[PDB]
A and B are shown apart, each in its own frame.
Chain A
Amino acid sequence: QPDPKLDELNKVSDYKSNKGTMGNVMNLYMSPPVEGRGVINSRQFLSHDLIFPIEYKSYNEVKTELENTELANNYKGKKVDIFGVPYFYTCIIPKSENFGGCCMYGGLTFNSSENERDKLITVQVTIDNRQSLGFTITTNKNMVTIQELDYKARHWLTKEKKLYEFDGSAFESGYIKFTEKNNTSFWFDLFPKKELVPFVPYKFLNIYGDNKVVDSKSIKMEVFLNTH
């Protein structure tokens, strides 16, 4: 898309020196994802979002936002599964008539009863271009959102390798890169822009709004991290 230069990656140290708290980002990837299996939207706020009557903790619905109306219309009124990262501060979800609730981007795949062996994907992690480990994540979906993968991966690294901590990280910068079978690739900067203080969740999570879907069986995942 193509691969980032070091100097273009967001820095943990810049985020801290702008008085930001990396714990906001930690909590998105440590707390559980929104999940729903075979659900159908109950309503909409704007024509590029779909409101789903799924439970998350004490919330009774989630608004998921798509990048444009046609993408929303691709899923509207259909049986889908939902998997994504919710936020609450800045979430705007008007009631059916009074304002806050649970929101997310993207997250959607068509529900399929022919979709039942878990696949394993090995995430390849490289640090400072010099040490590797891999771990594996699973999903039972043949066609999976990139969001689902990204979350499963960042969640393991946050819990096990200090990807995000309350006030920083074991790293200074990094990105996660996905490679599809046809050989093209894209990446996300793992860290928040230094300007994003206070942390405003929708501006970080809108990367999922394109509801990019991939084939579990063939997708390649690589993380690259730099220490300070």
Chain B
Amino acid sequence: AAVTQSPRNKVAVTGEKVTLSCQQTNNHNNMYWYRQDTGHGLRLIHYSYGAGSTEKGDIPDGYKASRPSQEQFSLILESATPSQTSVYFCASGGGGTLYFGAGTRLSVL
């Protein structure tokens, strides 16, 4: 696969630290973390233009990110809250093109 996410499903409790991993095989410079919610579609949380780069999207609050290499972009919830329950989608992109992963479902109890 172009883009793989792990885990695919995750149940956490409030206050729990949760990390979602996205790894790509396209050598793309750009990566993105979105979440998908009914009544909003996809909203961009953080993105990255290369290793060591992360920048805020529209809804960055409560999330960190890390792009330790070209291939990997992680989304870090230091202290999970119920408003973070959602389905997360990561994408990689290089000019013209975007590939999306299959989605990660997170429920926070």
Chain A interface residues (CB < 8 Å from chain B): 19-21, 23-24, 27-28, 31, 57-58, 87-91, 100, 166-167, 197-199, 201
CB < 8 Å: which of B29, B52, B55, B60 contacts A27? B52
**Is the CB–CB distance between A57 and B54 below 8 Å?**
no
A198-B53 contact, Cβ under 8 Å, with A23-B64, A100-B29, A167-B64 = yes
Chain B residue nearest in CB terms to A88: B51
A193 to B3 alpha-carbon distance, docked (Å): 35
Q: Is B26 an interface residue (CB 8 A)?
A: no
A28 cross-chain contacts in B, Cβ below 8 A = 52
A93 to B: closest C-beta gap in Å: 13
A sample of 25 inter-chain contacts (CB < 8 A) reads: A20-B56, A21-B55, A23-B64, A23-B66, A24-B53, A24-B54, A27-B52, A27-B66, A57-B69, A58-B69, A87-B52, A88-B70, A89-B48, A89-B49, A89-B50, A89-B52, A91-B50, A166-B64, A167-B64, A197-B55, A198-B49, A198-B53, A198-B55, A199-B55, A201-B53
A90 cross-chain contacts in B, Cβ below 8 A = 50
**Is the CB–CB distance between B53 and A89 below 8 Å?**
yes
Chain A residue nearest in CB terms to B61: A167
Interface SS majority for chain B: loop
Chain B interface residues (CB < 8 Å from chain A): 29, 46, 48-56, 60, 64-66, 69-70
Q: Compute the total of residue contacts between A and B using a CB distance below 8 Å.
A: 50
B65 to A: closest C-beta gap in Å: 8
A167 cross-chain contacts in B, Cβ below 8 A = 64
A87 cross-chain contacts in B, Cβ below 8 A = 52
Chain B residue nearest in CB terms to A199: B53
